[PDB]
Amino acid sequence: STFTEKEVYSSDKLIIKQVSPHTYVHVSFLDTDTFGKVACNGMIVISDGEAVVFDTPSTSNETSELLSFLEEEKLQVNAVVATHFHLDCLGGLEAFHARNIPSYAFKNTLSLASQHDFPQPQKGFSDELTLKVGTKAVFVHYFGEGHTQDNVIGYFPDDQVLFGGCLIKANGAGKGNLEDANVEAWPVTVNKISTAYPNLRLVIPGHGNWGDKTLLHYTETLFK
Ligand SMILES: [Zn+2]
Ligand SMILES: [Zn+2]
Numbered sequence: 001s002t003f004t005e006k007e008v009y010s011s012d013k014l015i016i017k018q019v020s021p022h023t024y025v026h027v028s029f030l031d032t033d034t035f036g037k038v039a040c041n042g043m044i045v046i047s048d049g050e051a052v053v054f055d056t057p058s059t060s061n062e063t064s065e066l067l068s069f070l071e072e073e074k075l076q077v078n079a080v081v082a083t084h085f086h087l088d089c090l091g092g093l094e095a096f097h098a099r100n101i102p103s104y105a106f107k108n109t110l111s112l113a114s115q116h117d118f119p120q121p122q123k124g125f126s127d128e129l130t131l132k133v134g135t136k137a138v139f140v141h142y143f144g145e146g147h148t149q150d151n152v153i154g155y156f157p158d159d160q161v162l163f164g165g166c167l168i169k170a171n172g173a174g175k176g177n178l179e180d181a182n183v184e185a186w187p188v189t190v191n192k193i194s195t196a197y198p199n200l201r202l203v204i205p206g207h208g209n210w211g212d213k214t215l216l217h218y219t220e221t222l223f224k
Pocket of ligand 1: 084086088147148166
């Protein structure tokens with residue numbers, strides 16, 4: 001019953017893996033002070049020749065590599081979503097903006113990005129955003145604070161896939177960077193996610209290996 005994952009792009013700086021019929025993980029790498037060399041995940045949803053991207057790679061160069069691949073595949077890139085204000089979500093937004101691809105994020109991500117002098121998403125939403133992807137859609141939803149105050153998820157119901165971003169930890173992973181975190185809210189937010197999407201088959205964390213609903217339960221337990 002498992003989908004046979006397939007690598008569809010690989011370079012020194014970026015890997016893209018198909019993880020379900022319509023969803024893909026993009027992986028870029030961050031050499032950071034306190035935690036080592038860090039893989040950062042985003043998601044691409046592709047259907048009917050159209051694509052929506054969740055998170056940019058941290059750097060402009062890696063984001064251009066991502067967009068070059070989507071262009072070689074002849075895809076219309078409809079939107080990019082920054083799932084919170086940190087650079088492993090939006091460091092590469094100008095590559096999207098240069099191509100007239102609109103960027104979206106939680107309303108508070110816009111103000112936080114501006115206050116940090118980071119690339120700014122163009123369009124804010126307050127609650128739940130629907131983004132068309134071909135004949136399907138992907139949904140962006142705020143369930144509360146956790147990894148940051150503004151973090152949002154992406155939900156693609158056709159394949160029962162959740163992009164948890166940095167609010168969701170890989171199975172067995174540590175708590176990671178808590179500098180901007182609300183650890184009181186975090187388990188409450190994650191339980192709201194589990195309760196909303198009980199049928200999930202695939203959960204993609206912001207860092208590390210993706211998996212199934214286990215990741216939601218693991219993350220809630222880690223912060224309980
Ligand atoms: Zn973050
Ligand atoms: Zn992160």
